[PDB]
Write a protein that binds this ligand. Structure first.
Ligand SMILES: O=C(O)[C@@H](Cc1cccc(CN(Cc2cccc(C[C@H](C(=O)O)[C@H]3CCNC3)c2)Cc2cccc(C[C@H](C(=O)O)[C@H]3CCNC3)c2)c1)[C@H]1CCNC1
Lengths: 80, 79, 80
């Protein structure tokens, strides 16, 4: 599994961060309250807890299930 | 008056930061808008402007009344 | 074109950050959702996308048109 460019187009199902943490669901505010919700980013594919890039970071990312770690990049490599 | 561990259990009355600033009230959104509110933290004892640790910081903290400084650790020692 | 004190009083028309990005409009909620609007800061001169200091930063600042970069200080030096 891989991403192209900055990964805004990435629509895979990876839900694990670079440090092995589980992604938080985009539709949950727990443990991290956020504004990266389907209502505000309807074309960004904010499904379940999948790694995404709704706000033009360098690569796909997610909020994490670890209360002490708000968000991280995903364990995902750049495409050949 | 002191905290144990990471101070998630702290329920004392200290309301002052490690720089001497006064804590903002948890129920207040001014000068700092936030979501450390009883709705998302029912167990956290978020009362008045008391130093608390709802969200697993390393020690009790509060939003500060200084508009320049969003939040700081509290002037509290470990038991 | 410069700021006095920490620039709370500043009402010039600069709309460019330190890294040369352009300010988002204060009334606009896109790309960054925020609280710094005419309602919650009534005397701050939150007009168009002009560099302001309503919330007691060290210097005037703005939210940026870059969706990733939330806010930056403006390219404005202090008055001599
Ligand atoms: O992470 C994000 O969601 C995204 C960035 C983002 C977007 C929108 C708003 C924020 C800011 N929030 C906190 C916050 C709320 C109100 C106001 C501010 C500060 C102001 C502002 O940024 O509007 C500035 C403006 C100029 N001087 C102050 C900050 C972020 C926030 C939201 C919830 C909790 C915290 C951390 C806690 C807090 O500050 O509660 C601290 C408090 C102690 N424990 C943790 C921080 C951040 C990134 C994710 C990947 N892409 C970008």
């Amino acid at each position: 599994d891989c991403y192209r460019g900055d990964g805004q187009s990435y629509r895979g199902t990876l839900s694990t961060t670079i440090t092995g943490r589980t992604c938080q669901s985009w539709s949950s505010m727990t443990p991290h309250w956020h504004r990266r919700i389907p209502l505000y980013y309807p074309n960004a594919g904010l499904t379940r807890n999948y790694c995404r890039n709704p706000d033009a970071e360098i690569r796909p990312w997610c909020y994490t299930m670890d209360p002490s770690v708000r968000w991280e990049y995903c364990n995902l490599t750049r495409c050949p």
